[PDB]
Amino acid sequence: KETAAAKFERQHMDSSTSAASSSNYCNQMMKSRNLTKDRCKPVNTFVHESLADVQAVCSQKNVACKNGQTNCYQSYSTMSITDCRETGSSKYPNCAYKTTQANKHIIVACEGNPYVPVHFDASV
Numbered sequence: 840k841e842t843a844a845a846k847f848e849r850q851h852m853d854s855s856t857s858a859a860s861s862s863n864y865c866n867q868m869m870k871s872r873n874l875t876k877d878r879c880k881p882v883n884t885f886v887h888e889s890l891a892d893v894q895a896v897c898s899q900k901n902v903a904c905k906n907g908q909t910n911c912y913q914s915y916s917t918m919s920i921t922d923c924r925e926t927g928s929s930k931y932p933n934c935a936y937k938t939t940q941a942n943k944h945i946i947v948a949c950e951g952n953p954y955v956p957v958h959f960d961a962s963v
């Protein structure tokens with residue numbers, strides 16, 4: 840299986856790099872994190888901060904989730920992130936992405952005891 844918290848780490852955590860510097864980043868990362876296995880996941884964000892810093896967002900600014908649930912949290916500080924967006928050239932299983940780097944506040948949904956990120960909602 841996979842816990843929701845572990846799935847969030849696989850899909851959205853990349854503390855190893857400070858920022859997307861390779862235009863290849865998303866093509867490589869979407870594949871290696873298994874987000875192109877059964878389909879090209881259309882949009883996905885990787886966060887370039889420590890796991891502790893991202894987990895800490897679960898105690899920061901409570902905001903509504905896009906789906907209407909109330910368990911979303913916005914980071915007080917901007918964080919370094921990389922948005923990966925599927926191109927038009929992209930046809931599964933050769934999924935192609937544009938790599939966009941930005942510094943933005945992240946919004947995650949949190950659940951559980953301990954209370955940890957389980958879903959990436961948005962960046963603002």
Ligand SMILES: O=c1ccn([C@@H]2O[C@H](COP(=O)(O)OP(=O)(O)OP(=O)(O)OP(=O)(O)OP(=O)(O)O)[C@@H](O)[C@H]2O)c(=O)[nH]1
Binds near residue numbers: 882884959961
């Ligand atoms: O920044 C993001 C957003 C999403 N995700 C991931 O993608 C999965 C679906 O998330 P969505 O259900 O939200 O698919 P979207 O395309 O984001 O939303 P729509 O376009 O339908 O409506 P909008 O035009 O309002 O969206 P926008 O213009 O960006 O505000 C989600 O589970 C995350 O893993 C992410 O990692 N980083």
Ligand SMILES: O=c1ccn([C@@H]2O[C@H](COP(=O)(O)OP(=O)(O)OP(=O)(O)OP(=O)(O)OP(=O)(O)O)[C@@H](O)[C@H]2O)c(=O)[nH]1
Binds near residue numbers: 847874906960
């Ligand atoms: O606003 C929200 C949204 C969700 N949740 C909860 O957060 C948990 C994981 O949410 P998801 O289970 O839906 O996982 P997501 O990160 O959301 O994005 P996707 O599943 O689309 O990516 P894939 O389906 O492609 O996964 P894969 O192909 O295996 O790599 C779940 O318990 C929700 O109830 C939440 O509390 N507030």
